[PDB]
Every structure is written in structure tokens, then in C-alpha cells.
Design a protein around this ligand. Structure first.
Ligand SMILES: Nc1nc2c(ncn2[C@@H]2O[C@H](COP(=O)(O)OP(=O)(O)OP(=O)(O)O)[C@@H](O)[C@H]2O)c(=O)[nH]1
Ligand SMILES: Nc1nc2c(ncn2[C@@H]2O[C@H](COP(=O)(O)OP(=O)(O)OP(=O)(O)O)[C@@H](O)[C@H]2O)c(=O)[nH]1
Ligand SMILES: Nc1nc2c(ncn2[C@@H]2O[C@H](COP(=O)(O)OP(=O)(O)O)[C@@H](O)[C@H]2O)c(=O)[nH]1
Ligand SMILES: [Mg+2]
Ligand SMILES: [Mg+2]
Lengths: 430, 182, 430, 430
């Protein structure tokens, strides 16, 4: 019951999913052949959340994979746990977008999306009670940031009451791999605010910083960043698949973390994270988890959370632990940092406990906090956008496929309005 | 005419008809003949040569067909004419005008090309322009066209002899122009 | 399901095509007979049983080079009737190969192009190679590009032209046809890469330590650059780049698409292994002005956008840590309206070595394609060379007598003046 | 229980009959002696024990060719008294072979035809071969057709006539008898196929790469076309076609039954196997104007109906997918009052190869029989050639003195004018 379907688009989203599904399968004891080989009874009670049942007793994820080029899905199939995905759900084009948002949203993405929407509708109509959808995509690419966001609007138009999740990677100015990143980032943020019920920003720069400083491993690769993102993704829905002292589905988090409908851009972090050589030194206790949870360097975004004030915060503890300690520590982390918490909403931290810890760990915490410090990312994105747009650089590529500069002006104005009205509440006082 | 128009409209995106070409140069040679060569990426037309005067008026309708770039060049050519033999002995490029028809006001029937040589202005051509979006050498060509209308076969022995006569004469006229240009 | 067709016209084009086609056959394990004793599909096609046929066509009016090809070791590889050959050479006369003898040959080439294109299903685009300072090369390249631009339309075409050196020259009349061909491909080619011989001679002398190089050594380096550019289409990589993802990242405006390339490392086996060849040092060497593949000084102009490809065991974090260092340096400055200018690609397959060649085997390499404002100097010097002889109308009779009009020389001069004005207008700050 | 009788008259007819009768004997496994060391019944008859006798008759007034036949390796095959031979040749005079010497021979031929027909039980129809530009061929063909049209009535007769080339000619008087024979067979033959020599010479030169062809090479291609046409009667196929199923599909009106043929692929063993010979490429090659078996341009006229035969391992869906592509092309346009114009036949038996011949062994082939409006050009040029000499009454005395009336020349001219007017009247849209 109350299950969700998985939809991913683009190369970055496909690579994120290729590790997210591996993590989920390892958590539920599903072999790469789709056969259950788990140890505990609880591993099968709520498997309908992510997995479907077919004849022969094997399980198949309800994931939908889409891209405008076939290479990435032809590569993910040969990887481990690549056989679980149903071949029918693979939809792709023969041309690609070339990191051009217009091509992936107006000319090419519009004709292809009917086929993927057909299978999306097939998956949603069938399921017992829908909880919602979760979306993984990147804002630095053309086909992803175009087709995914248009699909968001199409899904929202047909299921207005369901919940919608988006895990979005925004292009940081530090590690830049594409010159046209500001254009399709700014165009995508315009559409994303209007339809997504929840959005979670993730930055490659913050992932590299975490890998270099906390784990202290010499050579980070995309596999480590994907593993961290996958652990963070799994931590959110853990209590929906396992029993606990205070169950809290996604809708309950939506109620408690979004004060106003347009303020739904969160930054997350996962604890504990320790190096291989120091994993024996540390002792896992609730104070040790909560001190690392609120650490500024532990956030999955380069945004500095002590440059603003938290509107609200959430924590999803895992493992068996006493609730009194959790509540007193949450109170203590809020009394010692009163300057960084907005004062006109008292008791702005939500807590939840799940009795099933991750495989290999005795305690774990997932942190989701809505803070005013996120304005800095939109500020720098808009700064680069307005630095590049004033000369109409690279504009002809977009304008040759039916798009105009008016949609750029409206997007810039709406993004600046969002930036302004997000900080409006930072200076608000009672 | 309908089938030819249909083939033209299938191959080209638009036509420009140029009429009433008036050449004005800062200096004419009074003893020299001038003609206009009107060209685009798809072909070229030539006016009849006229004697140099303070303003020259070239009559003719010049249909210029486009498939992309809407630029016409007007080359001004000076010609030495041998009055005894009625042939062109040399052709010298005086200057080039450019008409950019994306900038031509659809409401202005009159257009002006500035003629330039080595980057300096040396005159202008004025013309009327309309836009639609979709034995002498001439006697020998007219005889060939009249045989094409009479014979169901593309290669009569008489046509082959006339085509050989035409080619020999064009080589002689080209040699006379190369001799006049020396 | 992704394909590309390479066009080779002229003596220089055929001699660099031979150079790239030993390298591709060696890299995909195909013997010179064409027989193997799913990545080949980008350049080759399967015949059903046994041999592979290249997706390439060789053009020339002068039969000597084709006859040399049809008797060498590669006689069995190419299809017998795609090596189109003429009888009479254009003899360095541009008007000949554009108006007199090229027209009767161009129809067969277009028929061959159609017959090759109907086989491909996912055609990415075309590649073309031609030495500019020759009659048949420049003329037939211009005519083929003009025919293809209307037969196919929006398909992408890439041109690896070899412009004459600043002072070193083999002919005496090459500025005329170089200027005319630049006129022709300015409005007809999507990408043009600079390849003059003098810079590559200096590269060989300084790094490879060869004091008597021949054309084969130059062509092998060009072949390596081509392989590095197209590796991302036929090998798995952490950060892929497609051909269609260029005009959205390197071409700010439709007129400006001439850029100059560089490669690193270039080193011989006698002293390669004594140093570690870290990613930082190779990416520093790639940006050195003396390692430009075209004899132009980047210190004389701004950068617009840099697209640079890695291959081997490089890790993205090391790439970011090196892009930061380059942004730090004061001798390299980017244009004002471009905050980020780097597009990064990472591939896993290390560069392959050709036996008996110059380059050694290494695990890391970098190839950069950079668009800079300094390229206007080559246009200015070619224009100055052209004006000197066009003042007295020298050598013009060799062109007027081949059907070309007198005024055709002037408009190419006007287009070059327009291009030089445009390059100055773009490079000024706001 | 299905039979067909082939008639060979004249030197060209006998020389193409020899060519087809090596091929049939080779295809059915019968040795040249006539002995095998149930499909044969279409062309042959069983004698009770041992040898097979062809259902063919050879006619000529000039004895040299028949004497050559009766001494070659095939002396034992044909029945001794069905090789009817005369004593005096007609010497390119049509009036001779229609009024003077052909009448005394035609009775024996008709007796032989009756003796062969009484043996058959399921007679499909007759085949006739005759080179038109000769006296005995055209005259005896006309007389035989006129006798058969009244002796048998509704039985179908097919004529594989070889008209003279546009400019290449062997005689000087062949337009006269060509026009007269066209007059004779216009109202007497159900199907006439164009076979002029110049087009087949060009085919051999371009594809077979033979620079010095002889008549045997032409006759082998004609024999292959005949075998492809009649394969459906003696081999199992997924989509069969009978001879009687032609006037219902290719002949819109009783007057219009002249059509021109083409064949594909035509390729030598030296370069055949390097390419895959897919059905799409062969069906594209068959429609190429340069591969017409008669020197006429199909681009100059509309199509009326296309009947095209396949043989080998071709699958119907691939045929449909290729008919769609041809309907797509803008250079091939059908007549307005014909929405669908294709009749498709598929057979399983691949074409057989003759040892020492030109063609190689392939698994797929296509033969098309297409009726088009462009055929009027050959009639117009033959008419123009006729008028030039008929203006001065040249060579007429050679015809008036052989019993023909003066006015007989004019009415053939009037019938050709009527045919040309009819072809123009049909091709105009409604
Ligand atoms: N990099 C490189 N350049 C070459 C090579 N061969 C010729 N060139 C250049 O090509 C220019 C002249 O054009 P070519 O390619 O030699 O001759 P072409 O293009 O066939 O033109 P034609 O003279 O009419 O045959 C010279 O200035 C050379 O610089 C080569 O092997 N490598
Ligand atoms: N395709 C082809 N045509 C031939 C061949 N032999 C002759 N012809 C053509 O036949 C025409 C003349 O007719 P022939 O067949 O040679 O002679 P005929 O039909 O027996 O008539 P007579 O001259 O009276 O004997 C010539 O114009 C040739 O083009 C041949 O072997 N193959
Ligand atoms: N975490 C992670 N990020 C990736 C991976 N591959 C690419 N990216 C990021 O995705 C961005 C490029 O997105 P792109 O591949 O063009 O998206 P697309 O246009 O939808 O295919 C780069 O800036 C990378 O930082 C990966 O395997 N893992
Ligand atoms: Mg040459
Ligand atoms: Mg004879």
C-alpha cells in the first residue's frame, strides 16, 4: 500500500538510479536475478512499495527509464543489477538534444513523450493506493532538464492530488562541465517551482568536498557520489517500508516542512560518515549523530547554512534508540543555536524514529532542512545567466527551434522574484 | 509556362524581378561601353552594353531565383567594342554593388545599390524590384530552339552542326575579348 | 545505432585519411584485410559475414594518390567504387574545381553519399578533410558542402581544414583560393578547425625531438586528435559528449565557428616513463601557447569557450582541481560575458599506439578544442597577402578564363572584412 | 499441367533463344544431351523414357544459324524437324518476308505449332522473340502473329522485341520495317517489351565493367529476365503471379501495352560479396533511370502501373517497407487516376548462375516490368527518322517491287500518330 513509482531521465538521473536500485535491492536481499535470499521476515512485508510481482516468483522494479539517446540505457543494462529493469520500460530516441533545452522540450521531447507517458499511465493506474512519484534528473543537461520538467507538468495535470518528489542536481560554478549550463538551469527552475511538491538540490561540488574532507579517500569517482546520493534517497522512505515508533510518510513531511506553497527547496545530508581508518575509533551515539547532522560541511550543497536562518528542520533517525534522548538532543541543538532559527515559528524541528537500521550500520540519520541560505545558489545562477544573456551569446541555438527571448525574460524575472520572496521571510520579525 | 513555373516554384523559395536599372558613376569614359552583370548564388544575367554617359538606363526584366541567401551582386563591366566586327574584345570590372533583399522594404518599388571599387564608392545603381515568395550568337540560339520545337528527337544532325558552329563562335569571341584586354 | 561519414578530398585530405584509417582499424582490432581474426558501428558497417567496410569516400581529380591507395596493403578494405577518381587535375586553380571539371564528378560523389546514408539509421553528422591551399581540394570541398547543405539541411558537418602557414608556403597562389574557400565555407560549415603545418612542425621538433619530419608524422598527430574527439561515441565514459552537443557550447554566434586545437601529452618512449604524467601537468601543457596546433598566439586575445576531452583513468575531482588552477592564472583571461567557459568530457579508453610511430603508450591524455578571439590574426595576414597581388590583378587571368566572374574576388574580401569587424565587436566588454 | 510455347524467328531471335535454352536446361538439371543424370513440365515434355524435348520452335529463312545450332553441343536436344529453315534470306526487306518467301514457309510452322499444342493440356500462352530491324524477323513475326490471332483467338501472346537504338544502328533501312512491324503487332500482341541494345551496352559497361561486350553477354541478361518472369509458374512461392494475370494489372487500355523492363542486381563476383545486397538497395537500384533495359528516361513521364518480381529469401514486410520509400520520393510520380500501382510477386528459388558467364551467385534479385508514359519518345524519334527518307520516297522501290502497295506506308504513319496522340491523352490529369 501507499507505494510510489520511479521515473528517471537523462544520463545523470540514469546513473543515480543505477545505484539507488542496487542499494534498495541489497537492503531487501534481492539478488541481481530477482530472487529473494533475505534473512528477516520484515524484508518481505512491505516489498510492494518499490517492487512488482511476476510469475515465477521474481520481482521487478516499477521504474521508467527515458533518454533522448540510447547509449546510457544500453550501458546501464550491462552493469550489476541491470537485468531487474523490465525491457518494455526502456524508451529512447535516435537523435538526442545536445544539451539544448529547446530541443529537449519543444521539438524532440514533445513527440517522444507520448510513449513514455503511456507506460507511466499504465504503471500508475494499476497500483493499489498511489502515494506519489519521485523524479531524478539533472539541471545541467538539455534533454534531462527539458523532458523531465515537461513530464512533471504533464503528470501534475493528471494527478493534482498526489505528491511529487524531484531530486535535482543544479550546475555549480566551481565544477563546470558545460558552457550552456546557466540557460537550461534558469529555464528549468522556472517550470520546477510551479509543479513540484518537493525539490531536493544536490551539487557535485559539495559531494567532492565531503568525499575529500570527511571520508578522506584519495580518488573520488562518480560511484561514490552516486552511493552517497543513493543512501540519502533511501533514508527518506525507510519508515514507510519498516515499522517504527513514529511512522511518517512523505505527505507528513510535506505538511511539516513547507510553510508556504512556493518554499519547497530543501538541502539534505546523511550521517554518520567516517573514514575507513577511523571507523573503529568512533562510538555511535545520538549526540555523535546529531552533532554531525547539523554540521555545515555535511550538507549535500555548497550553500553555507550559517549564512541564514532555518525556517524548519527534519530528522529521520534509524535503529533502535530511546526517544527521550532524541527529543532532549533536538531541544539542545535548538537552544544553543537560537540565532540561526527563525523566531516567529516555535518548535520548528521534526523527528521520527525507525527501528530498522541500514545493513551494516547500527544507527543512521537523514536530515532535511528548509533554510533561507539556499538563496545564494539562485543568486549565482542568475548572475551567470544575466552575464551571458546581455550579449545574446549562444541564443541563436535556442531561438532557431521556436523559442524566443520573451520566455527568457519571464524566466529571469520569476526566478529573481522567487529569490526576493524567499529572503523576505528571513528579515521578517514578530 | 504553367509546368515551367511549377518546376521553378518547386526548386526555389522566392523570386525577385529587377527592372529599370539606372547606372550613375562618378566618372564615365565617353568612348567605353558598359553592361551590368546581375548575379546571385544560382546564376547571372547580363544587360546589353550601352555607351558611357552621365546616367545609363538598362531596359529588361531580370528574374532572380533564391534558395537561401537573398543577396544580389550588380557587377559594372566596362567593354571595348570593335565597331567593325560587333564583338566584345575585353571586359574590365569597374565595380560591384550589393543588394541585400532582407533589408529591402516590400513597400518601396525603388532600390539603390552603392557601387564600390577597392572599398571606395564610385557610383550607384537604382532599380525597380518586385518580390514573390513561392550570323549573331542570338540568331544561332534561336535556330537551335526552333529545331528543338520541330524535332521529337533531342539530337538531329542539323542541331549538332549548329551547336558546333555556336561553340566555335563563342571561342572566337572569347579570344577577341582576351586580345582586347591585352 | 550512431554513425558518422568522413569525406576526404584532395591530396592532403587523402593522405590524412590514410593516417586516420590505420589508427581506427588498429583501435578496433580489424586487420588490414578487413577481417577480425559492438563499438565498430560508428565508423564501419557489417557485411553479414566477415569483413567490415569503412563509412568513408575518397575524392580526387588527379589519379596518382588513389592508385597508390588501391595497390597498398589496404586494397582489400575499401569498397572498389567509392574511391572516385578523375583524369585531369585542377592544378591549384580554384575556378577549375568549382566550375569546369568538378561539376562532372560531383554527381557521382553525391550518389555515393546517398548510398552510404541510406544504410545508416542514427546518422550523427559528416566529417570532411581538405587542404585549403589547392585547387581541387578547396573547390570540390566548397561544391560538396554547398550541395549537402541543401540536400540534407540541418545535419551537422565538421571541417578539418589546413590553412597555410604565416610565412612558410609551398605554392605562390594559395592566398587567392584560401580566401575564396573561406568565403564558401563561412556560411556553409558548422565547425572549422585550424590545422596549419608550421605549428605542428614546431611541436614535433620541440617535443618529439625529430629534426627531419615528413607529412606522415603530422598526419598521425591529426589522426590522434580525430580519435580523441570521436572516442566518446564508441566507448563507455563517466561524462559523455556528442557531436550535436557542440554548437550549444562552443559557438556563441552563427558566424563565429573557427577554433584552434591542442593536444597533450606529446612525448617519446625514451623519456616518457621518467615522469608521472599527472592530470594537472598535462592540462597545464595543453594550455601552453607553444603547444597550439595552429600558429596563433592565445595571449593576444580573449577566450570565448573551451571544450576539452580527457581519456584514460582520470578522475573528475582531479579535473576540477585543475580547472580551478587555470582560472587562477593571470596570463589567461576569459571574455566578460562568459563566467564559466569549460565543457569537460571524461572517457575510460586510453589512447592507442601505432607500431613504428612516434608517440608512446600512456594512460592519460587531454585534447582541447578552444574558441578564442585571437584567431583574427590569421585572417588579417591572409587578407594582407591577398591585397598585395590583387592590387595589380596578378594571376587573375588564370581564374577569369575558367568561367569565374571578375567581381567574385571582391565579395570574398568584403566578407573577410565583415568577419574581422565581427570578431572585434564581440571581444569588447560591456 | 501448365505449359508455354516459345517462338524464335530471325537471327537475333535464334541467338537469344540459344541463350535462354542453356539457362533453362541448367536450371532444371537437364544435361545438354537432354538426359537427367515435377517443375520441368512448363517448358519441356516427357518422352516416356529418358530425354526431354523443349517446347520451342526455331524459324529462319537463312540457313547458317540453324546449321550452327544443329552441329553444336545441343544437336541432340531439339527435335530434328522443328528447326524450320528456308533457302533464301529476305535481306532486310520487310515485303519479302511478308509477301514473297514467308508465305511458303508459314504453313509448316503453323503445322508444327498445332502438333506442339495438341500435346499441352493447360496451355498458358505463347512467347515470341524477334529482332525488329530485319526483314525475315519482322515479316515472319507479323505473319505468324496474324495467323495465331485467328487460329486460337483469346490465347495470350508475349513479344520480346528488340527495337533499334536512338542513334546506334547496324542497318540503314531499319526504320521502315520497324514502323511496319509496330503497325502489325499493335493490334495483334497482348504484351510487348522494349529491348534496345544501347541501354544494355551501358548496363554492361557500368556494372559488369566489361569494355568489349559481344551479343552473348546481352542475350544472357535477356535470358535471366525471361527466367525471372516465368519462375512463378514452376517454383513454389508465397505470392504467385500467372501470365494471364497481366492485362488486368499492367494494361489500362487495349492500345497501350508497350512497357520497359529493368533488372537488379547486376554485379560481378570480384566485388559482389563486399556489400550486403539488402532488398531495399536492390529495389532502389531497379528504379534508377540509368538501369532501364531500354534507352528511355522515366523522369520524362508518369508511371501507369509497376509489376515487379522478387526471388530468393525476401520477406514481404521488407518489400512493403521499400514500396513505401519509393512512394515517398519526389522524383518518381505516378499518374493521378492510379492510387496504387504496384503488383508484387515473391518466389523462393534464387537465380541460377551459368558457368563462365558474367553474373555472380546471389540470394536476392528483383525484376520489374513497368508501364510508363515516357515511352512515346522512341515512337517520336523513329517517326522522325522515317519521315526524312519517306519525304523523297527513298528505298521504296525495293518494297513496291515485292508485292506491297504504295499506300501501305502511310497508314502505319497514321497509326503511329494515333498512338502518340493516345499516349498524350492518357497522361493528362483530370
Ligand atoms: N598537413 C598536411 N598538408 C598537406 C599535405 N599535403 C599537402 N598539404 C597542403 O596542401 C596544400 C596544397 O594542396 P594539396 O592538398 O597539396 O593539393 P590539392 O588539394 O589536391 O589541390 P591540387 O593542387 O589541385 O591537386 C599545400 O600548401 C600543403 O601545405 C599533407 O600531407 N599534410
Ligand atoms: N540484342 C540482340 N540484337 C541482335 C542480335 N543480332 C542481331 N540483332 C539485331 O537485329 C537487327 C537486324 O535483324 P537481324 O536479327 O540481325 O536479322 P533478321 O531478323 O534475321 O532479318 P534478315 O536480315 O532478313 O535476316 C540488328 O539491327 C541488330 O540490332 C543479337 O544477337 N542480340
Ligand atoms: N553524480 C553523478 N553526476 C553525473 C554523472 N555523470 C554526469 N554527471 C553530472 O551531469 C552533468 C551533465 O549532465 P548531462 O549528462 O549532460 O545530462 P543529460 O543532458 O540529460 O544527458 C555534469 O555536470 C556532471 O556533473 C554520474 O555518473 N554521477
Ligand atoms: Mg593534387
Ligand atoms: Mg538473317
Amino acid at each position: 500500500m501507499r507505494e510510489i513509482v520511479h521515473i528517471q531521465g537523462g544520463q545523470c538521473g540514469n546513473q543515480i538510479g543505477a545505484k539507488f536500485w542496487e542499494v534498495i535491492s541489497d537492503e531487501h536481499g534481492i539478488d541481481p536475478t530477482g530472487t529473494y535470499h533475505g534473512d528477516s521476515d520484515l524484508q518481505l512485508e512491505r516489498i510492494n512499495v518499490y517492487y512488482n510481482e511476476a510469475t515465477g516468483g521474481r520481482y521487478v522494479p516499477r521504474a521508467i527509464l527515458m533518454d533522448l539517446e540510447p547509449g546510457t540505457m544500453d550501458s546501464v543494462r550491462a552493469g550489476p543489477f541491470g537485468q531487474l529493469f523490465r525491457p518494455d520500460n526502456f524508451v529512447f530516441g535516435q537523435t538526442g538534444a545536445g544539451n539544448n533545452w529547446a530541443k529537449g522540450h519543444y521539438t524532440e521531447g514533445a513527440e517522444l513523450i507520448d510513449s513514455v507517458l503511456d507506460v507511466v499511465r499504465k504503471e500508475a493506474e494499476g497500483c493499489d493506493c498511489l502515494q506519489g512519484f519521485q523524479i531524478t534528473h539533472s539541471l545541467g543537461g538539455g534533454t534531462g532538464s527539458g523532458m523531465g520538467t515537461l513530464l512533471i507538468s504533464k503528470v501534475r495535470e493528471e494527478y493534482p492530488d498526489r505528491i511529487m518528489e524531484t531530486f535535482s542536481v543544479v550546475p555549480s560554478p566551481k565544477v563546470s562541465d558545460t558552457v550552456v549550463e546557466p540557460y537550461n538551469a534558469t529555464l528549468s527552475v522556472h517550470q520546477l517551482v510551479e509543479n513540484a511538491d518537493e525539490c531536493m538540490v544536490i551539487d557535485n561540488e559539495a559531494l567532492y568536498d565531503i568525499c575529500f574532507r570527511t571520508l578522506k579517500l584519495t580518488t573520488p569517482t562518480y560511484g561514490d557520489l552516486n552511493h552517497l546520493v543513493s543512501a540519502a534517497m533511501s533514508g527518506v522512505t525507510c519508515c514507510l517500508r519498516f515499522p517504527g515508533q513514529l511512522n511518517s510518510d512523505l505527505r507528513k513531511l510535506a505538511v511539516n516542512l513547507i510553510p508556504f506553497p512556493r518554499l519547497h527547496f530543501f538541502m539534505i545530508g546523511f550521517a554518520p560518515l567516517t573514514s575507513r581508518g577511523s571507523q573503529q575509533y568512533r562510538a555511535l551515539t545520538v549526540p555523535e549523530l546529531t552533532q554531525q547532522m547539523f554540521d555545515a560541511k555535511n550538507m549535500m550543497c555548497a550553500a553555507d547554512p550559517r549564512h541564514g536562518r532555518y525556517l524548519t528542520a527534519s530528522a529521520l533517525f534509524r535503529g533502535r534508540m530511546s526517544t527521550k534522548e532524541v527529543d532532549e538532543q533536538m531541544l539542545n541543538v535548538q537552544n544553543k543555536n537560537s540565532s540561526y532559527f527563525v523566531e516567529w515559528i516555535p518548535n520548528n524541528i521534526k523527528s521520527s524514529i525507525c527501528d530498522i537500521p541500514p545493513k551494516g550500520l547500527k544507527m543512521a540519520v537523514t536530515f532535511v532542512g528548509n533554510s533561507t541560505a539556499i538563496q545564494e545558489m539562485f543568486k549565482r545562477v542568475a548572475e551567470q545567466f544575466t552575464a551571458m544573456f546581455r550579449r545574446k551569446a549562444f541564443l541563436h541555438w535556442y531561438t532557431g527551434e521556436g523559442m524566443d527571448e520573451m520566455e527568457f525574460t519571464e524566466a529571469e524575472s520569476n526566478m529573481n522574484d522567487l529569490v526576493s520572496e524567499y529572503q523576505q521571510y528571513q528579515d521578517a520579525t514578530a | 509556362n504553367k509546368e515551367q513555373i511549377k518546376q521553378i516554384k518547386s526548386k526555389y523559395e522566392s523570386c525577385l524581378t529587377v527592372t529599370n536599372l539606372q547606372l550613375s558613376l562618378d566618372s564615365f569614359k565617353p568612348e567605353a561601353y558598359y553592361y551590368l552583370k546581375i548575379r546571385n548564388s544560382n546564376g547571372s544575367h547580363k544587360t546589353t552594353p550601352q555607351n558611357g554617359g552621365a546616367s545609363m538606363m538598362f531596359q529588361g526584366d531580370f528574374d532572380i531565383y533564391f534558395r537561401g541567401q537573398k543577396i544580389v551582386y550588380i557587377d559594372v563591366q566596362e567593354v571595348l567594342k570593335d565597331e567593325i566586327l560587333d564583338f566584345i574584345t575585353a571586359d574590365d570590372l569597374v565595380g560591384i554593388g550589393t543588394l541585400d533583399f532582407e533589408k529591402v522594404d516590400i513597400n518601396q518599388s525603388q532600390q539603390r545599390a552603392v557601387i564600390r571599387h577597392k572599398g571606395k564608392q564610385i557610383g550607384s545603381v537604382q532599380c525597380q524590384a518586385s518580390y514573390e515568395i513561392f550570323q549573331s550568337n542570338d540568331e544561332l540560339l534561336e535556330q537551335i530552339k526552333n529545331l528543338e520545337k520541330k524535332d521529337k528527337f533531342w539530337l538531329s544532325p542539323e542541331r549538332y552542326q549548329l551547336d558546333l558552329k555556336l561553340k566555335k563562335k563563342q571561342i572566337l569571341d572569347r579570344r577577341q575579348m582576351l586580345m582586347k584586354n591585352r | 545505432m550512431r554513425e558518422v561519414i568522413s569525406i576526404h578530398v584532395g591530396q592532403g585530405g587523402i593522405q590524412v585519411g590514410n593516417a586516420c584509417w590505420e589508427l581506427f582499424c588498429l583501435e578496433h582490432g580489424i586487420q588490414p584485410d578487413g577481417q577480425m581474426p559492438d563499438a565498430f558501428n560508428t565508423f564501419f558497417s557489417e557485411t553479414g559475414a566477415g569483413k567490415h567496410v569503412p563509412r568513408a569516400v575518397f575524392l580526387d581529380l588527379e589519379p596518382t594518390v588513389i592508385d597508390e591507395v588501391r595497390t597498398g596493403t589496404y586494397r582489400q578494405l575499401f569498397h572498389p567504387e567509392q574511391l572516385i577518381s578523375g583524369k585531369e587535375d585542377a592544378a591549384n586553380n580554384f575556378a577549375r574545381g568549382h566550375y569546369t571539371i568538378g561539376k562532372e564528378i560531383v554527381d557521382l560523389c553525391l550518389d555515393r553519399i546517398r548510398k552510404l546514408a541510406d544504410n545508416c539509421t542514427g546518422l550523427q553528422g559528416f566529417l570532411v578533410f581538405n587542404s585549403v591551399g589547392g585547387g581541387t581540394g578547396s573547390g570540390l570541398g566548397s561544391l560538396l558542402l554547398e550541395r549537402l547543405s541543401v540536400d540534407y539541411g540541418k545535419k551537422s558537418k565538421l571541417g578539418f581544414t589546413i590553412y597555410p602557414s604565416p610565412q612558410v608556403s609551398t605554392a605562390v597562389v594559395e592566398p587567392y583560393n584560401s580566401i575564396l574557400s573561406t568565403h564558401s565555407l563561412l556560411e556553409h560549415t558548422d565547425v572549422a578547425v585550424m590545422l596549419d603545418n608550421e605549428a605542428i612542425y614546431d611541436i614535433c621538433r620541440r617535443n618529439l625531438d625529430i629534426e627531419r619530419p615528413t607529412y606522415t608524422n603530422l598526419n598521425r598527430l591529426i589522426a590522434q586528435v580525430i580519435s580523441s574527439l570521436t572516442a566518446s561515441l564508441r566507448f563507455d565514459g563517466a561524462l559523455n559528449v556528442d557531436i550535436t552537443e557542440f554548437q550549444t557550447n562552443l559557438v556563441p554566434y552563427p558566424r563565429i565557428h573557427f577554433m584552434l586545437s591542442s593536444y597533450a601529452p606529446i612525448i617519446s618512449a625514451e623519456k616518457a616513463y621518467h615522469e608521472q604524467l599527472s592530470v594537472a601537468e598535462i592540462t597545464n601543457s595543453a594550455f601552453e601557447p607553444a603547444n597550439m596546433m595552429a600558429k596563433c598566439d592565445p595571449r593576444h586575445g580573449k577566450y570565448m569557450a573551451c571544450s576539452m576531452m580527457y581519456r584514460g583513468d582520470v578522475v573528475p575531482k582531479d579535473v576540477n582541481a585543475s580547472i580551478a588552477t587555470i582560472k587562477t592564472k593571470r596570463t589567461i583571461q576569459f571574455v566578460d560575458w562568459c563566467p564559466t567557459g569549460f565543457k569537460v568530457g571524461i572517457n575510460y579508453q586510453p589512447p592507442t599506439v601505432v607500431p613504428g610511430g612516434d608517440l608512446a603508450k600512456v594512460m592519460r591524455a587531454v585534447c582541447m578544442i578552444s574558441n578564442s578571439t585571437a584567431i583574427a590574426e590569421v585572417f588579417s595576414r591572409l587578407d594582407h597577402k591577398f591585397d598585395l597581388m590583387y592590387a595589380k590583378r596578378a594571376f587573375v587571368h588564370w581564374y577569369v578564363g575558367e568561367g569565374m566572374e571578375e567581381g567574385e574576388f571582391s565579395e570574398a574580401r568584403e566578407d573577410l572584412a565583415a568577419l574581422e569587424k565581427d570578431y572585434e565587436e564581440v571581444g569588447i566588454e560591456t
